[PDB]
Design a protein around this motif. Structure first.
Motif, PDB file in Angstrom:
ATOM      1  N   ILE A   1      11.050  -1.008   3.397  1.00 30.91           N
ATOM      2  CA  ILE A   1      10.443  -0.176   2.728  1.00 30.91           C
ATOM      3  C   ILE A   1       9.822  -0.701   1.570  1.00 30.91           C
ATOM      4  O   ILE A   1      10.384  -1.269   0.851  1.00 30.91           O
ATOM      5  CB  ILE A   1      11.424   0.964   2.051  1.00 30.91           C
ATOM      6  N   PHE A   2       8.386  -0.221   1.248  1.00 28.58           N
ATOM      7  CA  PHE A   2       7.718  -0.682   0.255  1.00 28.58           C
ATOM      8  C   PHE A   2       7.872  -0.093  -1.231  1.00 28.58           C
ATOM      9  O   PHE A   2       8.130   1.379  -1.259  1.00 28.58           O
ATOM     10  CB  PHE A   2       6.257  -0.606   0.484  1.00 28.58           C
TER      11      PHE A   2
ATOM     12  N   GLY B   1       7.475  12.208   3.117  1.00 33.22           N
ATOM     13  CA  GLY B   1       6.975  10.804   3.525  1.00 33.22           C
ATOM     14  C   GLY B   1       7.398   9.879   2.496  1.00 33.22           C
ATOM     15  O   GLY B   1       6.872   8.528   2.356  1.00 33.22           O
ATOM     16  N   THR B   2       8.237   9.988   1.527  1.00 30.25           N
ATOM     17  CA  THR B   2       8.600   9.075   0.575  1.00 30.25           C
ATOM     18  C   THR B   2       9.758   7.989   0.897  1.00 30.25           C
ATOM     19  O   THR B   2      10.064   7.278   0.235  1.00 30.25           O
ATOM     20  CB  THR B   2       9.321   9.772  -0.690  1.00 30.25           C
TER      21      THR B   2
ATOM     22  N   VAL C   1       2.432   8.563   4.696  1.00 28.93           N
ATOM     23  CA  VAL C   1       2.614   7.523   5.700  1.00 28.93           C
ATOM     24  C   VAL C   1       2.821   7.897   7.005  1.00 28.93           C
ATOM     25  O   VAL C   1       2.486   7.247   8.073  1.00 28.93           O
ATOM     26  CB  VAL C   1       3.713   6.466   5.014  1.00 28.93           C
TER      27      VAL C   1
ATOM     28  N   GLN D   1      13.963  11.925  12.656  1.00 29.83           N
ATOM     29  CA  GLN D   1      15.097  11.003  12.802  1.00 29.83           C
ATOM     30  C   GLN D   1      15.380  10.664  14.214  1.00 29.83           C
ATOM     31  O   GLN D   1      15.971  10.057  14.606  1.00 29.83           O
ATOM     32  CB  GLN D   1      16.278  11.438  11.809  1.00 29.83           C
TER      33      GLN D   1
ATOM     34  N   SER E   1       3.852  18.061   7.407  1.00 28.18           N
ATOM     35  CA  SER E   1       3.837  16.590   7.392  1.00 28.18           C
ATOM     36  C   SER E   1       4.326  16.051   8.575  1.00 28.18           C
ATOM     37  O   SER E   1       3.955  14.722   8.935  1.00 28.18           O
ATOM     38  CB  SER E   1       4.231  15.771   6.273  1.00 28.18           C
ATOM     39  N   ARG E   2       4.961  16.765   9.429  1.00 30.16           N
ATOM     40  CA  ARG E   2       5.739  16.169  10.708  1.00 30.16           C
ATOM     41  C   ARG E   2       4.942  16.362  11.988  1.00 30.16           C
ATOM     42  O   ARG E   2       5.217  15.886  12.847  1.00 30.16           O
ATOM     43  CB  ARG E   2       7.020  16.912  10.897  1.00 30.16           C
TER      44      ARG E   2
HETATM   45  N1  LIG Z   1       7.452   2.376   2.709  1.00 31.62           N
HETATM   46  C1  LIG Z   1       7.443   3.495   3.158  1.00 31.62           C
HETATM   47  N2  LIG Z   1       7.105   4.663   2.394  1.00 31.62           N
HETATM   48  C2  LIG Z   1       7.077   5.911   2.995  1.00 31.62           C
HETATM   49  N3  LIG Z   1       7.411   6.361   4.345  1.00 31.62           N
HETATM   50  C3  LIG Z   1       7.772   5.240   5.057  1.00 31.62           C
HETATM   51  C4  LIG Z   1       7.625   3.852   4.510  1.00 31.62           C
HETATM   52  N4  LIG Z   1       7.958   2.931   5.719  1.00 31.62           N
HETATM   53  C5  LIG Z   1       7.924   3.630   6.586  1.00 31.62           C
HETATM   54  N5  LIG Z   1       7.961   4.919   6.276  1.00 31.62           N
HETATM   55  C6  LIG Z   1       8.023   5.931   7.394  1.00 31.62           C
HETATM   56  O1  LIG Z   1       8.682   7.292   6.744  1.00 31.62           O
HETATM   57  C7  LIG Z   1       8.973   8.003   7.690  1.00 31.62           C
HETATM   58  C8  LIG Z   1      10.313   8.484   7.331  1.00 31.62           C
HETATM   59  O2  LIG Z   1      10.307   9.714   6.634  1.00 31.62           O
HETATM   60  P1  LIG Z   1      10.606   9.710   5.091  1.00 31.62           P
HETATM   61  O3  LIG Z   1      12.224   9.175   4.976  1.00 31.62           O
HETATM   62  O4  LIG Z   1       9.518   8.892   4.156  1.00 31.62           O
HETATM   63  O5  LIG Z   1      10.816  11.270   4.462  1.00 31.62           O
HETATM   64  P2  LIG Z   1      11.426  12.240   3.456  1.00 31.62           P
HETATM   65  O6  LIG Z   1      10.299  12.205   2.299  1.00 31.62           O
HETATM   66  O7  LIG Z   1      12.643  11.454   2.818  1.00 31.62           O
HETATM   67  O8  LIG Z   1      11.519  13.611   4.131  1.00 31.62           O
HETATM   68  P3  LIG Z   1      10.991  14.935   4.217  1.00 31.62           P
HETATM   69  O9  LIG Z   1       9.661  14.597   4.559  1.00 31.62           O
HETATM   70  O10 LIG Z   1      11.549  16.034   4.876  1.00 31.62           O
HETATM   71  O11 LIG Z   1      10.939  15.431   2.692  1.00 31.62           O
HETATM   72  C9  LIG Z   1       9.060   7.141   8.974  1.00 31.62           C
HETATM   73  O12 LIG Z   1       8.060   7.524   9.757  1.00 31.62           O
HETATM   74  C10 LIG Z   1       8.811   5.696   8.403  1.00 31.62           C
HETATM   75  O13 LIG Z   1       8.280   5.003   9.616  1.00 31.62           O
END
Ligand SMILES: Nc1ncnc2c1ncn2[C@@H]1O[C@H](COP(=O)(O)OP(=O)(O)OP(=O)(O)O)[C@@H](O)[C@H]1O
Ligand SMILES: Nc1ncnc2c1ncn2[C@@H]1O[C@H](COP(=O)(O)OP(=O)(O)O)[C@@H](O)[C@H]1O
Ligand SMILES: [Mg+2]
Ligand SMILES: [Mg+2]
Ligand SMILES: [Zn+2]
Lengths: 566, 595, 189, 92, 93, 193
Positions: B287-288, B328-329, E35, F143, F192-193
């Motif tokens: 994770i970046f 996407g965080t 992403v 997930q 976003s999903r």
């Molecule tokens: N550095 C990254 N930053 C963000 N997303 C990443 C990173 N590396 C991978 N991902 C992708 O993030 C996705 C997982 O979703 P993520 O945990 O970012 O959601 P969330 O923001 O915690 O949840 P929600 O969108 O429900 O609020 C996976 O598809 C993974 O491939």
């Protein structure tokens, strides 16, 4: 000069006479960093010198540049220098700038011979001999295995006459025969370990450990130069039969050491993996079944189903496999294998057991040693890589001691990993059809592989090359064509090209198969490098492997195709 | 007849097996008898090496030969320890291929098998008989029986007139052993398509009891057998060995399961000048960015230090972290990593949870008709971390059911007669979304957060992660993710999950730093300034701050300081840690409150 | 200070080996040094070495004998107590006398370890049998030592026929425990 | 044979003059003995050793040793005992 | 039976399209870009490679996936800015 | 299946063969084909999990052949389950907890997403769902797992399912003059999903 088969005792006595004084060390040994035969021969020599209390130093050496550096850095108190695994082909006297006058100690007019402070002994199996070392020099002493006397009389006559010198016609024809002799390619004709074992038998120091090291050295040539191994096999069989105690009725004891000649197989690490994995990751099996595609897996599953071995049983590890099938394996394999074309898997090998421990074969021991050598662990990065390989040499050397068995197990694990990686890379190469079939040779260049950091080592590159040579190149009833394999590394932006000799179908005795095939890539590579502003590095001991810059490969290969000397 | 020969063969293995110059099993036996551990662990690779025939018998009929190898061990132990002792237990180790839990069927009945799973429940120890003394009702004749716990035994039916079943056990002269029952569930990944995970009943004896806790992955060597409870039998596994990656014994009692050689490695690692950087980089290597959240996760894994004052008051020593942000965080991925690195952890979704699912639930036993208590997520995670994902989807009541367990670290129950106060010392790591899915800067902070001040004040650090579209960062993330998709440092800049988990355990059970006076003065001045800053911000806006700053935040800063000190096995926390703690607090909670 | 803390009040196993390696042993020279240069030693006698004859029993220091054996120039003659039969007799003596130690030499363990490591082809019995016998004897003596440790006191104590390596193993525990007992007793008066 | 910021200046002076004292002791009638020598008894006369860190052709009292990294020697323990102590060599 | 793998790909192309999508999606009310969609591009490329029973993802598959994602993004825009967006993104479609 | 696939335009004869009884809608058919074939899941070093399935949303006008496409996808997929807006519940999808009539002990039942493991879950009338029911599939859609903590059960399941959902814009007809966000009631996390 050169020492005949019977002069090994004389050479050994000279070494003892000169470089043996408890005051200081006067012996140094240089070893090819990445040659198993040289490793085993140097282990034998180290034990032999330890017995007689001769102080020595052993220096691993990668490439000719390191050899020149270390020889220049040698002290003047060293009376004898030993080179194992190299030096025969190059001109040592010219290469090392050795002036015989400077190294002379005393000269006797009556004797007609001169004494020199240093002596250099060459233990090399490569051919052809450099006629300067064999016949011209005196500081250089070459351990011959009969070739000079068997098949070098005319060359000797020509060289002696040329040194001795209407005459233009004779001079021309003599240089012509000399050039003809120099034109032929390079090949290995014997094993150094066999030579050292012959010396030991001459002086009477042969035991079981020395025989084990000799067997390892000899079997290290089985994969490539099978025709040397097939010639040296009877002597090893006779030695094992002679050394082994006659009676075996005694039960196992915690100290009993056994060395038998049992049925071995052309399978990858049979006794340390499942019966399935041994077939799956075998060069010969993949060549004869094309396991890299789904039809191959289906065919292998069909074979196992026919043999009567459940898939679950086959995938079980060797030790815990059902013992009925393990006992019947010889019967089950012999009827079933001929149908699938895998009949030549049947073979006789050497298996060594130490009381109450698992039994390991010579082939698997060699595989473990090689795996430890390979992955055991601008110019600055190159030097760092070569230093790392020199470091791995000592891991592989330690693995030869029965007190170090964890290292051997670690080597077997690494060997399995490396074979898996090579299988994946070969699958990627064959699926994409990256092999270009030109009229002079085959070409394959890797540019974006997933595991490209592995192939910076010449040994791993040659492993992949052998895998490719066996599969879809040995078979398919295609004409024998040499292959060129190259790989890139972004950290240095250069290629590691490696010419590879073709191999006849395995286990097919024939008059044409009896004849050996030489490797001409050294001559063509040197010619092209000299003619073009290549920037090629030809310092590796194996002259078929060089280094090229990222932007020179295309001109180099174009000129290679246009050369026609391949 | 044959039994004596088999016993003789296994006795010669224990007396003649040397791999070099040390008798491994003779010396293992003497060393075990000296500390009162009547057992011998034998590796089956060594037996296949001594005599393959002995292995063939032990594998062909396991429940008949294992009882004869125990008596051989007992005889050798008597010969070695007594100069002229219950039956010794035999624990087995093997490297055979593991059979999936669901692949065990009729083809494996009465055979030695190896398998893995997750322990979901453990029973209260029972007592099994090993030597009965019996007497006859009528003629009063005394006799004894000897029992091995390997089933294919009952009191004699006819005396030695006396009616049927004439024997009654004399308890004050009999001897018993310990027995336990375990439920084993298959690993989530092994499960086939569209199938619920399947259970399997297991039993252990004597020295294999109290070795596991619910929720820990284990590897089992045992015998797949059957017991009658029509022409069907209910299968079960008779454990012969347990191997786990979690030192449950160290975690429940003192510090244990760390060899001096292993302990030396941990001290060496602690001496590293930049251990903080290595640990921060070791969390979520894939994770970046998000360095601050990774440092917060390091502090949460490390934990603070708990104090029991003389008057009885207890001070929480765990750190709770909330991640609020846009989609996407990579909050869910961070939670899934933290669940995998921590020695004890449970991943739960706020939507698929309930007040009883968390904490504890009251259940009725169908047989005894008696209510008992079963632990939930917060009990199953005791001593570890709970990862509550989708924290915003949780219902108001199910969320309210968490306040006491988050602050006081206890679960008070008063239901169906059962009245108790369980213990739940867990760290909560929560992920949530704002009301509108994205944090909208246009509206006030009181509009983007539906959490009440009471629940929010219980979190030590609150992270309001905002996704800003910056071309440089976007290109960097794209390159990193593509490298991940198409594509091992282990050179002092990152440590594997196993080593990190063991180091966490060692630090938790070995260190509990304390603040020095300088740190106290620094933290006290900072608290006064932060509270003034909230007041200046509040005076400016009629609205009352949605992110609170109470004494709990002062205690949170103290906990962060103590965790940072504990990270390096430093018995005292100095200003060099207070500055980092203040920086992290400003980067998360004051940052959230400022907006 | 000048002496490490682990070498204070006791000897290390290497020190015990050093002490043991000065006792004489019997060897069969494979060379004839006797005249019909010359050794010149100062720590032992050199007449025996200057007078050697092939296949003639002679006595030299153990370390010189090991050095010669390393060169395949002498075959060490194993002591008489290190045969199978003698070890069986000693085991029986230990078994029948629960309250005493057998009359093994004061260097039996160290010499056994040295000779097994170095001279494996100079015994007339299988090496595995001798290793087993020595292991059995060690276990019996360990049982006896464990039983005898229950009589530590503020006065003297007697451990007859206990070898050097065993005494070195037990020296710290015995000495410190008895010292604490003496300190308590003396404080009593 | 005979970091410093941790020590107080008094301890630094003590250490300096104590090393002076040790050297003075070594210079006396016990010269033939290496008082700051090895306290493990000598067991083997010849040992295999490996160079652990690269250095030039160090010229010790016993002779000249070409310390190339990753190179082995068959030498007498007595000669190379100091180099092992410093860390230039390893016994293996 | 088929699990295509990404070996040879123009990293710059994908990175540059992702950055463009983000910058253009900064506008209020637009379809969210995270992403997840950068990964969706690769998922669609793998799917296209799978459609051919090919063991390796080709450049044409990645181009087609980029086109699919970019179009699907553009179609959702308002009428007023759709023409400008289509002109700006014509490089990848 | 390996001659059909070496030909050069299979990637487009496959898109053509998706619901051929529907006249146009090439983008919808391409998305449906992509979702049917799906991506490749990948576990990087055993620490990072990345989804490998494609989710599709059809947001169109009343008579535009959406439900027919969903029905075709149900026919063609190996494992498919069809759900309608208000006929589905939060626990109907995912998993539920019941008390077994025989043993009288709490147990776990598999819902739609479990039945759609390695398959497709087709949700029609997506915009008319209850908010509580709609928010339930958030974890499963990314997930690929369902986490349940209820009645003493703490377990995580596997839901490796792709979602193809059909929705109707606000007002019953898409307003091309407004942005997408204003034309649907869904929020950023679900979109976003
Ligand atoms: N550095 C990254 N930053 C963000 N997303 C990443 C990173 N590396 C991978 N991902 C992708 O993030 C996705 C997982 O979703 P993520 O945990 O970012 O959601 P969330 O923001 O915690 O949840 P929600 O969108 O429900 O609020 C996976 O598809 C993974 O491939
Ligand atoms: N592009 C099209 N091609 C063929 N039939 C269509 C098309 N669009 C609509 N239809 C017709 O509309 C009917 C299905 O409408 P439906 O998709 O159920 O409405 P909704 O989109 O509200 O679900 C079918 O009978 C079908 O024949
Ligand atoms: Mg999430
Ligand atoms: Mg519809
Ligand atoms: Zn009776």
């Amino acid at each position: 000069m050169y020492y005949g088969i019977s002069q090994f005792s004389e050479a050994y006595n000279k070494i003892l006479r000169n470089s043996s004084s408890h005051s200081s060390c006067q012996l140094v040994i240089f070893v090819s960093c990445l040659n198993i035969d040289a490793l085993c021969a140097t282990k034998m020599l180290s034990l032999l010198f330890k017995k007689q209390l001769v102080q020595s130093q052993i220096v691993p050496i990668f490439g000719y540049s390191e050899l020149r550096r270390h020889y220049s850095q040698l002290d003047d108190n060293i009376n004898s220098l030993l080179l194992v695994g190299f030096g025969g082909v190059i001109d040592l006297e010219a290469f090392l700038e050795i002036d015989p006058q400077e190294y002379v100690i005393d000269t006797d007019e009556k004797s007609g011979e001169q004494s020199f402070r240093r002596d250099i002994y060459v233990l090399d199996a490569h051919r052809p001999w450099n006629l300067d070392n064999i016949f011209g020099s005196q500081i250089i002493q070459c351990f011959d295995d009969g070739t000079v006397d068997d098949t070098l009389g005319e060359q000797k006559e020509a060289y002696y006459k040329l040194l001795e010198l209407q005459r233009k016609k004779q001079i021309h024809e003599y240089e012509g025969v000399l050039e003809e002799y120099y034109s032929q390619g390079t090949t290995v004709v014997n094993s150094i370990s066999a030579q050292i074992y012959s010396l030991l038998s001459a002086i009477g120091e042969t035991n079981l450990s020395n025989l084990w090291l000799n067997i390892l050295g000899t079997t290290s040539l089985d994969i490539a130069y099978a025709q040397v191994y097939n010639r040296l096999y009877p002597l090893l069989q006779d030695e094992v039969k002679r050394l082994t105690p006659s009676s075996r009725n005694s039960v196992k004891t915690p100290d009993t050491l056994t060395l038998n000649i049992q049925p071995d197989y052309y399978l990858f690490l049979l006794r340390h993996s499942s019966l399935y994995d041994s077939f799956y990751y075998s060069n010969y099996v993949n060549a004869k079944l094309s396991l890299w595609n789904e039809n191959g897996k289906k065919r292998l599953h069909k074979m196992f189903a026919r043999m009567g071995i459940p898939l679950s049983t086959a995938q079980e590890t060797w030790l815990y496999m059902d013992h009925s099938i393990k006992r019947e394996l010889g019967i089950i394999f012999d009827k079933n294998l001929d149908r699938y074309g895998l009949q030549d898997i049947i073979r006789d090998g050497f298996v060594r057991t130490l009381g109450y421990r698992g039994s390991i074969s010579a082939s698997e021991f060699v595989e473990a040693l090689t795996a430890l050598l390979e992955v055991g662990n601008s110019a600055q990065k190159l030097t760092n890589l070569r230093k790392r390989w020199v470091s791995n040499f000592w891991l592989s050397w330690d693995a030869l001691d029965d007190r170090k068995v964890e290292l051997l197990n670690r080597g077997i694990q690494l060997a399995q990993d490396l074979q898996r990686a090579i299988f994946n890379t070969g699958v990627a190469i064959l699926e994409k059809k990256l092999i270009k079939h030109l009229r002079i040779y085959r070409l394959c260049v890797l540019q974006d592989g997933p595991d490209l950091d592995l192939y910076r080592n010449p040994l791993t590159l040659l492993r992949l090359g052998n895998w490719l040579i066996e599969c879809c190149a040995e078979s398919e009833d295609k004409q024998l064509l040499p292959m060129v394999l190259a790989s890139i590394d972004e950290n240095t932006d250069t290629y590691l090209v490696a010419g590879l000799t073709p191999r006849y179908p395995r286990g097919l005795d024939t008059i044409h198969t009896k004849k050996p095939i030489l490797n001409n890539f050294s001559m063509a590579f040197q010619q092209i490098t000299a003619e073009t502003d290549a920037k090629v590095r030809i310092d590796n001991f194996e002259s078929s492997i060089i280094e090229i810059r990222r932007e020179d490969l295309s001109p180099f290969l174009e000129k290679l195709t246009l050369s026609g000397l391949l | 007849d044959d039994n004596t020969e088999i016993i003789k063969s296994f006795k010669n293995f224990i007396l003649e097996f040397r791999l070099d110059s040390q008798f491994i099993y003779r010396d293992q036996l003497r060393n075990n008898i000296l500390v009162k551990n009547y057992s011998l662990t034998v590796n089956m690779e060594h037996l296949i090496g001594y005599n393959e025939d002995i292995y063939k018998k032990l594998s062909d009929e396991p429940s008949d030969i294992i009882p004869l190898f125990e008596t051989a061990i007992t005889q050798v132990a008597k010969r070695i320890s007594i100069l002229s002792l219950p039956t010794f237990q035999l624990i087995l180790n093997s490297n055979a291929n593991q059979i999936p839990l669901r692949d065990l069927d009729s083809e494996h009945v009465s055979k030695i098998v190896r398998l893995s799973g997750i322990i979901i429940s453990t029973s209260v120890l029972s007592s099994r008989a090993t030597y009965l003394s019996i007497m006859c009702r009528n003629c009063r004749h005394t006799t004894s029986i000897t029992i091995n716990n390997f089933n294919s035994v009952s009191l004699p039916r006819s005396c030695l007139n006396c009616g049927p079943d004439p024997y009654i056990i004399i308890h004050e002269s009999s001897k018993f052993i310990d027995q336990q029952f375990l439920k084993l569930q298959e690993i989530p990944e092994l499960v086939p398509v569209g199938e619920m995970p399947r259970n399997l009943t297991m039993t252990c004896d004597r020295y294999l009891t109290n070795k596991v806790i619910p929720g820990t992955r284990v590897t089992i060597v045992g015998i797949y057998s059957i017991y009658n409870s029509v022409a069907i039998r209910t299968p079960y596994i008779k454990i012969l060995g347990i191997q786990s990656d979690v030192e449950t014994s160290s975690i429940w009692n003192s510090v244990t399961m760390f060899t001096e050689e292993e302990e030396e490695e941990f001290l060496q690692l602690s001496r590293n000048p930049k251990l903080y950087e290595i640990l921060t980089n070791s969390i979520a290597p894939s994770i970046f960015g998000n360095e601050d959240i990774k440092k917060a996760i390091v502090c949460l894994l490390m934990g603070g230090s708990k104090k029991i004052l003389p008057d009885g008051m207890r001070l929480r020593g765990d750190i709770n972290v909330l991640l609020l942000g846009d989609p996407g965080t990579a909050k869910s991925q961070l939670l899934k990593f933290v669940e995998k690195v921590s020695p004890i952890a449970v991943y739960t979704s706020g939507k698929g949870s309930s007040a009883a699912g968390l904490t504890a639930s009251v259940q009725r036993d169908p047989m005894t008709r008696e209510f008992y208590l079963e632990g939930g997520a917060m009990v199953l995670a005791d001593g570890g971390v709970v990862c509550i994902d989708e924290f915003d989807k949780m219902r108001d009541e199910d969320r309210v059911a968490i306040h006491e367990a988050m602050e006081q670290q206890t679960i008070s129950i008063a239901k169906a007669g059962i009245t108790t106060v369980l213990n739940s010392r867990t760290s909560v790591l929560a992920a949530a979304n704002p009301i509108y899915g994205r944090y909208d800067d246009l509206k006030s902070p009181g509009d983007n957060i539906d959490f009440q001040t009471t629940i929010l004040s219980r979190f030590d650090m609150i992270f309001i992660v905002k996704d800003d579209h910056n071309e440089e960062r976007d290109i960097s993330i794209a390159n990193h993710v593509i490298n991940i998709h198409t594509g091992q440092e282990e050179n002092g800049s990152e440590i594997s999950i196993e080593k990190m988990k063991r180091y966490i355990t060692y630090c938790r059970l070995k260190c509990a730093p304390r603040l020095s006076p300088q740190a106290a003065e620094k933290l006290s001045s900072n608290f006064v300034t932060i509270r003034k800053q909230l007041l200046i911000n509040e005076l400016e806006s009629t609205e009352r701050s949605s992110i609170p700053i109470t004494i709990r935040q002062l205690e949170a800063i103290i906990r962060i300081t103590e965790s940072l000190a504990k990270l390096e096995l430093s018995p005292i926390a100095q200003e060099r840690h207070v500055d980092e703690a203040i920086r992290l607090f400003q980067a998360s909670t004051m940052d959230a409150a400022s907006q | 200070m000048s002496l490490p803390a682990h070498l204070q009040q006791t000897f290390s196993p290497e020190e015990i080996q050093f002490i043991v390696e000065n006792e004489p042993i019997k060897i069969f020279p494979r060379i004839t040094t006797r005249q019909k240069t010359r050794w010149q030693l100062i720590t032992t006698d050199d007449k025996a070495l200057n007078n050697m004859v092939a296949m003639r029993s002679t006595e030299v220091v153990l370390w010189i004998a090991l050095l010669l054996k390393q060169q395949s120039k002498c075959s060490i003659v194993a002591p008489q107590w290190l045969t199978t039969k003698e070890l069986d007799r000693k085991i029986q003596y230990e078994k029948t006398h629960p309250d005493r130690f057998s009359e093994l030499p004061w260097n039996w363990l160290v010499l056994a370890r040295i000779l097994f490591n170095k001279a494996k082809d100079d015994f007339h019995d299988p090496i595995h049998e001798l290793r087993g016998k020595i292991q059995d004897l060690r276990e019996i003596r360990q049982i006896k030592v464990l039983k005898g440790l229950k009589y530590l006191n503020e006065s003297h104590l007697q451990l007859d026929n206990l070898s050097l390596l065993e005494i070195n193993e037990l020296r710290p525990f015995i000495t410190e425990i008895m010292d604490k007992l003496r300190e308590i007793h003396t404080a009593s008066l | 044979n005979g970091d410093t910021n941790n020590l107080s200046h008094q301890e630094q002076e003590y250490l300096k003059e104590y090393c002076d004292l040790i050297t003075d002791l070594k210079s006396g009638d016990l010269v033939d003995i290496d008082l700051s020598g090895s306290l493990v008894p000598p067991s083997d006369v010849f040992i295999d050793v490996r160079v652990l860190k690269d250095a030039g052709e160090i010229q010790t009292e016993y002779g000249v040793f070409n310390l190339i990294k990753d190179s082995q020697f068959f030498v007498r323990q007595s000669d190379v005992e100091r180099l092992i102590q410093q860390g230039y060599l390893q016994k293996i | 039976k088929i699990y295509p793998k990404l070996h040879q790909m123009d990293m710059d192309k994908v990175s540059r399209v992702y950055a463009d999508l983000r910058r253009e999606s900064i506008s209020t009310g637009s379809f969210p870009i995270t992403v997840r969609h950068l990964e969706s591009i690769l998922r669609i490329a793998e799917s296209f490679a799978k459609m051919r029973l090919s063991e390796f993802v080709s450049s044409y598959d990645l181009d087609r996936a980029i086109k699919v994602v970019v179009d699907s993004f553009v179609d959702a825009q308002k009428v007023s800015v759709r023409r400008q967006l289509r002109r700006s993104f014509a490089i990848y479609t | 299946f390996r001659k059909i696939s070496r030909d050069r335009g299979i990637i487009d004869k496959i898109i053509s063969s998706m619901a051929p009884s529907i006249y146009g809608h090439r983008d919808i058919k391409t998305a449906v084909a992509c979702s049917l074939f799906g991506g490749v899941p990948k576990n990087v070093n055993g620490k990072h999990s990345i989804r490998g399935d494609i989710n599709v949303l059809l947001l169109g006008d009343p008579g535009t052949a959406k439900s027919q496409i969903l029905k075709y996808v149900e026919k063609t997929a190996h494992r498919a389950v069809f759900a309608t807006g208000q006929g589905a519940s939060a626990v109907g999808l995912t998993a539920s907890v019941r008390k077994d009539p025989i043993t009288k002990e709490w147990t776990l039942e598999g819902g739609a997403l479990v039945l759609a493991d390695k398959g497709v879950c087709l949700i029609d009338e997506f915009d008319k769902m209850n908010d509580q029911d709609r928010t339930s599939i958030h974890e499963a859609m990314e997930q690929q797992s369902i986490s349940i903590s209820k009645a003493g059960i703490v377990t995580t399941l596997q839901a490796r399912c792709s979602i193809i959902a059909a929705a109707n814009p606000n007002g019953g007809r898409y307003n091309s003059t407004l942005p997408l966000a204003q034309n649907v009631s869904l929020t950023e996390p679900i979109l976003s999903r």
